[PDB]
């Protein structure tokens, strides 16, 4: 079966370089063109160009000339996308895709490779309590990088009524999220409430007691 | 965008819907090399129509394509929940170049409308001790997944310091979002109150908090 398998997610600083691989199997690599397609956050698919796997000639769409290089290695039936002098606006999921013919373009696609370009540096979160016939209370998980953060409550014993919201990306490049739980008001004073916040990328965990 | 598609289309289960795709320039020539792709975010796009109407046997027979003048059209009959996705048309434009339309978000209305629940938290004591102030507006249980958020200081609008997420699907298949307003401690205590205003399907839910 035809298979395009791309390399894993990349996290880069502006001005750095990245090289995404697209390994193929199930067909003769040099018989068909390999195309590249980008999807930036909140945008549609954008055709980047292609490379002729017989001649090596690359074609770059306007917008992807100057810093992008399509290449391949026939010894391992693999195509590559390299980006120089990465910019924040290069942040996107990058796909490789085969063209079978003019009639049938992009019949097989890679799974996509997320490339994130940010000037931010690893930073653990600052956790603040969100004090409270039900009562809502929570934790504000502020100013961390990179994704992801996980949250539990009372070391996982409190699962009912819990809603952890996806994080917002700030203009500074840092993330923030909140977790809220709805509990009986009669329990305030009876029951202790702690959110357990874990940010593996900074080797940080925070347990924050939330009280009235 | 060389190919114009509607930003969104909605239909209810069992109905048929049509997504249009109009060429913006004469570079498409005959406009006989039109293809369509289904894209579930997070997975690779999937070819479903090529050469205007040709359906590969591996796509569902509920998908068909047609053309009139310079408008290509994708029709999905017997609409099902799994059809909910982004759809892109695509055309050859000569000189070994391809282009994608802007995309269409197809919503399958398998669910009654739901007004958002809104919870607004003021800055915590701790945060204020650190000389920062964050208002936390948590928005949940709305359908369809689209809201706009506006903030007010007393009664005057505020766009500066506002960070708002995209709506994310909840486990119950309703939608959630959050919005944060960053202030100085002085600003927070300067005003009588702040308000978070959530607009959904033309109706607005507003919550208020005050330092008092």
């Amino acid at each position: 079966q035809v298979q395009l398998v791309q390399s894993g997610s990349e996290l880069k600083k502006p001005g750095a370089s990245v090289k995404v691989s697209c390994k193929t199997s199930g067909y003769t690599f040099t018989t068909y063109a390999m195309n590249w397609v980008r999807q930036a956050p909140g945008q549609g698919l954008e055709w980047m160009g292609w490379i002729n796997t017989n001649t090596g000639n690359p074609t770059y769409a306007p917008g992807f000339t100057g810093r992008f290089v399509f290449s391949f290695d026939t010894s391992v039936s693999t195509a590559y996308l390299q980006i120089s002098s990465l910019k924040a606006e290069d942040t996107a999921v990058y796909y490789c895709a085969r063209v079978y013919s003019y009639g049938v373009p992009f019949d097989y696609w890679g799974q996509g490779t997320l490339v994130t370009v940010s000037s931010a540096s690893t930073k653990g979160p600052s956790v603040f309590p969100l004090a409270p016939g039900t009562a809502a209370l929570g934790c504000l998980v502020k100013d961390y990088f990179p994704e992801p953060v996980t949250v539990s409550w009372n070391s996982g014993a409190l699962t009912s009524g819990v809603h952890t919201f996806p994080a917002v990306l700030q203009s500074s490049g840092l993330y923030s999220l909140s977790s809220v739980v709805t509990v009986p008001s009669s329990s305030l004073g009876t029951q202790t409430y702690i959110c357990n916040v874990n940010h593996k990328p900074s080797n940080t965990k925070v347990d924050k007691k939330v009280e009235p | 965008s060389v190919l114009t598609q509607p930003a969104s289309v909605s239909g209810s289960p069992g109905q048929s819907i049509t997504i249009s795709c109009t060429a913006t320039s004469s570079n498409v020539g005959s406009f006989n090399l039109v293809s369509w792709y289904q894209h579930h975010p997070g997975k690779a796009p999937k070819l479903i129509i090529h050469e205007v109407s040709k359906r590969p046997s591996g796509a569902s027979n509920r998908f068909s394509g047609s053309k009139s003048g310079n408008t290509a059209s994708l029709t999905i009959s017997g609409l099902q929940a799994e059809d909910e996705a982004d759809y892109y048309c695509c055309s050859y434009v000569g000189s070994d170049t391809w282009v994608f339309g802007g995309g269409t978000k197809l919503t399958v209305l398998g669910q009654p409308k739901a007004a958002p629940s809104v919870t607004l938290f003021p800055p915590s004591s701790e945060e204020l001790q650190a000389n920062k102030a964050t208002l936390v507006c948590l928005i949940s249980d709305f359908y369809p997944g689209a809201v706009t958020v506006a903030w007010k200081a007393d009664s005057s609008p505020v766009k500066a310091g506002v960070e708002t997420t995209t709506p994310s699907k909840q486990s119950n298949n309703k939608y959630a979002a959050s919005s944060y307003l960053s202030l100085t401690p002085e600003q927070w205590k300067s005003h009588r109150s702040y308000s978070c205003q959530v607009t959904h399907e033309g109706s607005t839910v507003e919550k208020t908090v005050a330092p008092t």
Binding site: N54, S101, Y102 | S95
Partner: peptide, 13 residues
């Protein structure tokens, strides 16, 4: 520009 390509042709000449 030759936009009216033969659909059966393979661009990877």
């Amino acid at each position: 520009a030759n936009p009216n390509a033969n659909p059966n042709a393979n661009p990877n000449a």
